[PDB]
Amino acid sequence: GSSGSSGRKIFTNKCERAGCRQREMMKLTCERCSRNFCIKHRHPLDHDCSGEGHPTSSGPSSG
């Protein structure tokens, strides 16, 4: 039985911004978080950039 419908085509990109459905003909990835976004949210100032900002260091083993 048909379960789930996959969709992937090299035509347009999909912004990774919250409550955003902007499709930029060209691919736009941030330089800090390295995530896809729309020209509008392409800048790290018009989008909650969570790339190079949160301090992380190896500690726990589990995970």
Residue 36: strand, helix, or coil: strand
Nearest to 46 by CA among 26, 24, 13, 20: 20
Q: Using the minimum distance from each CB to Zn ion, give the nearer residue, 21 or 58.
A: 21
x/- mask, Zn ion, residues 20-49, rule CB under 5 A, reads x-x-------x-xx----x--x--x----x
With left for phi above 0 and alpha for psi between -120 and 50, is residue 59 left, alpha or beta? Answer: alpha
Residues that bind Zn ion in the complex, under the rule CB under 5 A: 15, 17, 20, 22, 30, 32-33, 38, 41, 44, 49, 51
**Which residues participate in the annotated binding site for Zn(2+)?**
15, 20, 30, 33, 38, 41, 47, 49
